[PDB]
Amino acid sequence: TEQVTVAEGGVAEITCRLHQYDGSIVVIQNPARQTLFFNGTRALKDERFQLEEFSPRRVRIRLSDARLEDEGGYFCQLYTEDTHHQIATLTVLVAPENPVVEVREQAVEGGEVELSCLVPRSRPAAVLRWYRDRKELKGVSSGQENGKVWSVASTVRFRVDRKDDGGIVICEAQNQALPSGHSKQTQYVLDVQYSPTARIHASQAVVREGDTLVLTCAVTGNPRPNQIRWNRGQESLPERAEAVGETLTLPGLVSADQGTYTCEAANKHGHARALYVLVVYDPGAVVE
């Protein structure tokens, strides 16, 4: 009895070996033990079954668009009841689709991200594996059979911080219906929110009276801060100051412009403020 295996909707071939062909009538039966081919003639009105070869050595039939209901034993016997012989058992497989990946809720630095991965239909039951940066994560899985096909789900949960924002997680599904070594994969991009940062970088290390200084405020955060605020301790920004987004330009600096300058930004997880100490040296000061 030949073990024959097809992917759902694919093509299988079933062959009856006959030995010293008498010329008598060959009955081929399906898994319900209903006559499917009477000698060379199809006995059931199913256009997916086609006689392919009736030679002195074998009778071969082809099945197109294989369905789960086609599974079971197929038989070949002489109408004279020489023997009830099973000549094949058909098994129909179902490969997983690319898995569906979801997240429980918005992940926030300091908290957890919780992901699920689901394959709704596979046969045999797909195996689900989680990867991050080539390294496998340990998840938790469950599945069940719904008729002849299995639904399988897996979940993983881990702490995140801002370094994980934008990181890629892979869920990978495998089963025997896929060619050896191959996989069905789904990528998921982490979105981790975090409180902002602010840092000032100045266009010069040493500032002299007469200089034009540019301060640049580098900001991070998720969500992205919408607005940079520039300010100064104790008193107002110099009259010539030009605060345009992330840059503060201080032209024509004079001694009285010295002081502490700040840039600040915010998102829904908090504020960040950077401070810059501005020293303005007269032309004769010895600094370096």
Ligand X SMILES: *[C@@H]1O[C@H](CO[C@@H]2O[C@@H](C)[C@@H](O)[C@@H](O)[C@@H]2O)[C@@H](O[C@@H]2O[C@H](CO)[C@@H](O)[C@H](O)[C@H]2NC(C)=O)[C@H](O)[C@H]1NC(C)=O
Residues binding ligand X (CB under 6 A): 21, 23-25, 39-40, 54-56
CB 83, min distance to ligand X, A: 18
The span from the first CA to the last CA of the chain, in angstroms, equals: 93
CB 20, min distance to ligand X, A: 11
Provide the Cα torsion 157, 162, 166, 168; round to 10°.
-30
Q: Are strands 85-93 and 35-38 parallel, antiparallel or unpaired?
A: unpaired
Instruction: Please say which residue, 47 or 288, places its beta carbon nearer to ligand X.
Output: 47
Report DSSP letters for 227-283, one per residue: --EEEESSSPPPTT-EEETTEEEE-S--GGG-EEEEEEEEETTEEEEEEEEE--B-T
Contacts of 285 (CB under 8 A, 6+ apart): none
CB 129, min distance to ligand X, A: 50
Instruction: Please say which residue, 54 or 131, places its beta carbon nearer to ligand X.
Output: 54
**Which run of H or of E encompasses 221?**
strand 213-222
Of 212, 76, 186, 82, which is closest to residue 131 (Cα–Cα)? 186
Backbone phi, then psi, for 163, in 5-degree steps? -60, -20
CB 126, min distance to ligand X, A: 42
Instruction: Please say which residue, 40 or 166, places its beta carbon nearer to ligand X.
Output: 40
Distance CA 16, CA 204 (A): 89
Of 246, 254, 266, which is closest to residue 197 (Cα–Cα)? 266
Instruction: Please say which residue, 38 or 281, places its beta carbon nearer to ligand X.
Output: 38
| Length of the chain measured in residues | 288
CB 44, min distance to ligand X, A: 17
CB 37, min distance to ligand X, A: 10
Amino acid identity, position 15: T
Per the structure block, which two tokens stand in for 245? 């987004």
CB 46, min distance to ligand X, A: 19
Instruction: Please say which residue, 55 or 180, places its beta carbon nearer to ligand X.
Output: 55
Instruction: Please say which residue, 42 or 229, places its beta carbon nearer to ligand X.
Output: 42
Instruction: Please say which residue, 36 or 263, places its beta carbon nearer to ligand X.
Output: 36
